[PDB]
Design a protein around this ligand. Structure first.
Ligand SMILES: Cc1ncc(COP(=O)(O)O)c(C=O)c1O
Ligand SMILES: Cc1ncc(COP(=O)(O)O)c(C=O)c1O
Ligand SMILES: Cc1ncc(COP(=O)(O)O)c(C=O)c1O
Ligand SMILES: Cc1ncc(COP(=O)(O)O)c(C=O)c1O
Lengths: 456, 499, 456, 452
């Protein structure tokens, strides 16, 4: 019964330890329910199962700030970081304390009385963001933040006769249908077509191709409402644009009267060595999207911040764009604590130092193993290792997993492995990660050599 | 500085009490930051400000299961219920305990190791839902659940050559751009057009108009992929369809080979007197959307549940449709606790009993006040009172607010006032809500009767100015006697007619 | 060589007679060139080939006003009438004389000097059309006339925020991509999708379904710019709406602020017993489309006539909507002569009298042959016979062809056979057509009886 | 009454000459009916009215092959050529004779019996066109030919999952809503939006920008069904692409599996010095569009010619794409006669020779008048003179009109004046046109020097 299932799960939530028999029963039950009620594809394509040993690797609790402990007591150093969620580590005490304090008062707002933490977070974000960014709309995810940015741009530009949107190939802006029209990967989009009309893509980091697109749109009467881009493409493989590119896009948008939307869902909250990646060139977009790390690794949250000029489209009818849970007190408490931690501990400067050290180590391994590795790239703690092929990349991800270092990479998506550890990763843990990567590459080379000896 | 602002907010999060001077400083700061950084429109159109007195009504903490306490210590009975979020009350101890226990272990998942609570919640939801609904996709909101439903329908129907979607007028399915294409209100959609192509709308509760839309699409080669609808329209004003309508939509979808998507974001989790409103007629949709109360009034969560036939479009590439935070352990712990509370306390049966009692009371008040009230409607704890006009509805919402009974209604959207209390509302509190509604209606009638008496006594022809001024003076002095004073002035006017 | 091919065709154009050997060589050459350069499907699905005997039936010259003579000297009474083109017969002497006179002066306009016949035809059409219809735009076909109507409606309604168009199922408005968005037949539209957005269809002749569509569009913010419909559906099978329907659509369009577009490409120029079918109920559309018979059966022409209120969208920039050949002197001369013939000879009144007689004859045959015929329908000289099935309808079309009476119907589209003879068809020829139809039905019944007896 | 109006017009059609009083009455009536029933905008923006003197310039008859005579007896040398319709001159006797002969037999087809001239013209066009172009679909105009090309590309490419179309900025492909989606001018498109989805534009003559568009579409899952372009842009101002460009577009279409549609409605039928402009580089498109001069300056006609690979999408249901009047006997007779005239008289070679002579003359005038003329461009008899500004260009068009030489140019669209005379323009007339252009420029310089 649903009653029995819920009671069994509540008992598991209360438990902190599992002996060998309790672990075996739990892991088996979890794998069965993933197969019958979640998605059997997760069992086929995840290294927590393909390289998870006899019982599979099932989550249990956070170990220390930068580690996770599975149901078998295995401790993993976290270099996946939820793809940029865990900037301040796992269960950061300041974030956890803020969420616990707010939970004791009121976790969700009434939807009528003015809610103080929405006002405090909006004020704090206005102080933290560059130039004229002043108003914030709160939501629950990165894709919701991008939907709110596209809607602000539409409400501002439709009365001005502009409806077209330009995005870049390789871009990832979310999977809800509005955000998916800007998202560029063919496999994510094709089954869901037709998407929103008037979305066009140009190569990322190519200013002349962007100018051509905006100019051709102007000549044909399909004037561009907004350009949307990530400062550095995450899902696209940690693709850095040429220096000056973001400043050139800003000038182009000003020239054509298009709004500039910067998607900092992955680069935001200190990851690239500054609070926002737009700060490396001192660029101020018209609309800024945040999510992932803004919730401190404790709550889901998204935020869309804009100038008063753009945001004022929501003033006459404040119910035009809304969300039920967006800006709830628990999420705001987590975000306020995260901003406090990042600034008090100077974690963006730590991301620059640790990211330079890790990227130097990965680049040196790339030089030593050109038979396996193509290139290592990064800015701050947003890094990627590109392998010679998908099979090699998945073998590296699986080997690191067996060495208890968690990295990105699924069975058919592992040619480029993103490395995004918490900004709180210790210097000793940075050294352990490099040592593990070297051991994995050495083991992989031996396996390839032993396969070539058998065939010869 | 951002550091100083965050430290000041963390200090506020740590406080549990506020004296009069701390309340005044906090309320003033909150109003200023809403104006400068949130939306000055909230200050103009919300009754927490227009009927909030000298300092405004600012949130502070939950009082009891069914009440909220503002920064001034004023306690409100909650009949708004976050528009259907607070089904198990405010800070339900079982839900709060589950979230606290999970926070001590791991609040957000790794995105690699298998996460147990996602598997437990998916299993519990399969056991709770009707028929062949078996697989769940977790997300963070109602609009995300509807986006996932539209995407499941698209991935299944595009290889079968079907792309069109039918929704109903009055429908509300969310405000993200995919969901907004199904959402029907013109004011929510027009500034954002063009939306997705191939969305059409038919009147809600009209099966022949739905059949015509499906058939005309078939004839022109624009075959319908899916029909999406709420079992009862919430935002549309608590609109109940005719008996048998949901079963008739199910048969029509089967006949045309269209998928049926039932949006139970507002009706789900016991609100209408059953766990899901589709259980009143025993209808099984192909896809079911949940959110709002699924998070227990503690966490944001959404869920899209489908048959294995439909959901299997995601098996070959389980990364085709994903969400970063969706299905996180805190949200799953809150949902598992909510389902446990609803079943252990049989809150859906309580929603039927309390909803019947409240709706009987509102219907009796509608009979007594046809000058102000057009109709009272509802199913379980999903109710609405429709007033004669917007102004009257906002006066009722403001009067209930002054009596510390929180109801729906904003300055320009108050002709229909939704009443969606927690399913845990006590029988005593149900009686108090009815008494407050009667007091609000009686106060509103006094204001109207006085206004009509002032305009009639000024225009009575056969009365002298000494008499006219004395009646007008008595109306100002005693507004409760407005009906009696008008009858006395009318009798004297007829008696002093030209002989 | 192209030179040799063109010289051979010019020699054929000059020839008026063909002996048996010349006919055999010509028919064989025509069939071969249709297979190799036109479309081999015409040879498979046309009764001029499937019921064309040993040599096929190839066109040669017009016989009398209502007849055609093939390359073998076979004379056919024309009841197909080019689907409503030949209203004033084949080679009507008044139309032919006007075209010959204009050809001796200037057949095509300069595109600079003001062309007199465009001005004369626009004036004549304003006098002929009801109420406030005053301005004409000339083009070359029915589908071009519909494109011009949709463009007039778009230019008027887009500044008023209305973009949606309502058409009816069964409707046929042309096959160019704009007109095809209103055209309703699935097989004509599906390979060409996506078509224009915002086009929606309701059942023809159902006023409540049209009111629902307009009302739902208003509620959702997709307000209807225009409603387009035929007064009687031609391609849809001669579908007559209930009496009062066109007047009710006019009132509904006025109520919602939508424009009314009447497509009279098939019903126009006297075919239904009045000059325009909208005259039966005295309905004035905002825009009226004409083509087919407007060219007198001699020239291609189309015309889109609108009120000054709507047409004035073209006044500030008279080059906004144009055509290269539209309104040329030959086409205008043919149209002016056609209007003169229809009015001088009272051909709309003749269409009413002859149409009532032919439809009475067909309905009596339907009464006698319910084993083959389902129903006969019509208004004036726009008629149709619906058979029990496609096979039976094609057998009737083929039998009439063997009796030298030309009717509509192709191999896989013959359940409903349209009958649209010239309005000049003599009373003696009306009687011959009914006698030929009776002979065809009697022959068809015998064949069915002889087949049912063989299987028993 | 409509009966009285039609009788009055039939009387005018029968008249061959007009005296001074008949001309005055006719011109006044024509201007009034244009104002009240056609479009009053034509009276404001046309040089036949703004530079038409006391009575306006109203058409009456063709003078000789290369001249037009108005209602006042004024004879104009035609360098406008209907923007590329009058390739074989006005009332070419071979074309007129063919149309008259066919009118005596059957002007419009039955829509059932096989019509011989449709088969003869399709055969002649297959012999005339390059490589694998074999099947023809006949229609009535350039915009209809483009609609048929877009539909052939859609029916071939939709089962292959490709729906996007690439056209170039500056392109003109017609004004019906499907063709208008490819047509690039903002003023022609904006009032009619939303047009067909999935249409994009790249700069004309820029192969790398076209490759980027095709590649970005491939990466996002919006694969391109077809590329559509003119070999030389007409309405865009006689814009010649770089050498090798059409061959590079052909290779790029083959690489991405997109169809190549060449719109030769303006360049076709000998105008650029070859029968089709695609013959200069020997490029074979998948679909070729023709119209304008294909009707010999006597009939409206359009043709869409394609390979059997593409056209075969219409074989299973030959009624899928149709047009009532398309391929009618009068139009086919006119086209057969036009092809016969062009080949017998080698008019494409004459267009190359006369075009070189005219463009040399215009380029010499550009060198002498840089104060008024920016540049002269052309290929064969498709030419343009670009002026320093719109006002100067309209002054040139108006001055040439007063010297009885008809050129393109309207009040607000005259910065680039297209010169597209009949290919039959005599060598003497070429010299007279150059002399009139010099006189017009000299008179314009005097008027500017008056202000300065
Ligand atoms: C740049 C970017 N935009 C948007 C998103 C979507 O955010 P969410 O998964 O929270 O919907 C992501 C998530 O990976 C992202 O990296
Ligand atoms: C029926 C219905 N669907 C969808 C939604 C949207 O949910 P959310 O506000 O969480 O995006 C709501 C919320 O009001 C709803 O009532
Ligand atoms: C009602 C109607 N509209 C439009 C058209 C299309 O006209 P055309 O074939 O001349 O393009 C037709 C032709 O059959 C028609 O009957
Ligand atoms: C290149 C081109 N394509 C298409 C067209 C449209 O032809 P029509 O005006 O006959 O519709 C033209 C006419 O100017 C043209 O030059």
């Amino acid at each position: 019964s649903a009653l029995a299932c819920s009671a069994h799960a509540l008992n598991l939530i209360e438990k902190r330890t599992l002996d060998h028999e309790e672990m075996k029963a739990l892991n088996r039950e979890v794998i069965e329910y993933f197969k019958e009620h979640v998605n059997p594809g997760f069992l086929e394509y995840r290294k927590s199962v393909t390289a998870g040993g006899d019982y599979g690797a099932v989550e249990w609790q956070a170990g220390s700030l930068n580690t996770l402990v599975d149901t078998q007591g295995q401790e993993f150093i976290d270099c996946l970081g939820g793809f940029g969620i865990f900037n301040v580590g796992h269960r950061n005490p300041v974030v956890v304390s803020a969420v616990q304090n707010q939970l004791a008062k009121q976790p969700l707002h009434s939807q009528e009385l003015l809610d103080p933490l929405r006002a405090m977070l909006a004020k704090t974000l206005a102080a933290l963001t560059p130039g004229k960014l002043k108003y914030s709309f709160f939501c629950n995810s990165g894709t919701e933040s991008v939907e709110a940015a596209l809607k602000l741009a539409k409400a501002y530009q439709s009365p001005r006769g502009k409806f077209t949107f330009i995005a870049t190939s390789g871009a990832f802006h979310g999977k809800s249908l509005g955000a998916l029209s800007a998202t560029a990967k063919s496999t994510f989009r094709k089954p869901f077509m037709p998407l929103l009309p008037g979305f066009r893509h140009v190569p990322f980091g190519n200013i002349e191709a962007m100018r051509t697109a905006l100019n051709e749109c102007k000549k044909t009467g399909d004037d561009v409402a907004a350009v949307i881009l990530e400062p550095i493409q995450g899902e696209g493989g940690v693709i850095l644009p040429p220096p000056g590119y973001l400043t050139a896009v800003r000038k182009l948008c000003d020239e054509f009267g298009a709004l500039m939307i910067l998607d900092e869902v992955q680069t935001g909250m200190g990851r690239t060595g500054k609070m926002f990646a737009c700060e490396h060139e001192n660029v101020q977009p018209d609309i800024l999207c945040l999510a992932k790390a803004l919730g401190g690794g404790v709550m889901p949250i998204g935020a869309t911040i804009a100038t008063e000029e753009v945001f004022s489209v929501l003033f006459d009818n404040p119910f035009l764009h809304t969300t039920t849970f967006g800006g709830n007190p628990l999420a705001c408490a987590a975000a306020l604590a995260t901003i406090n931690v990042l600034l008090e501990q100077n974690l963006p400067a730590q991301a620059e130092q640790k990211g330079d050290m890790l990227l130097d180590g990965f680049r040196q391994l790339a030089r030593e193993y050109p038979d396996l590795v193509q290139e290592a790239r990064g800015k701050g703690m947003l890094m990627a290792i590109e392998f010679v092929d998908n099979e090699i990349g998945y073998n590296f991800a699986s080997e690191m997993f067996r060495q208890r270092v968690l990295v990105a990479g699924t069975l058919n998506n592992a040619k480029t492995i993103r490395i995004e550890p918490p900004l709180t990763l210790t210097i000793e843990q940075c050294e352990l990660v490099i040592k593990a990567a070297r051991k994995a590459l050495a083991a992989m080379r031996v396996s390839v050599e032993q396969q070539n000896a058998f065939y010869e």
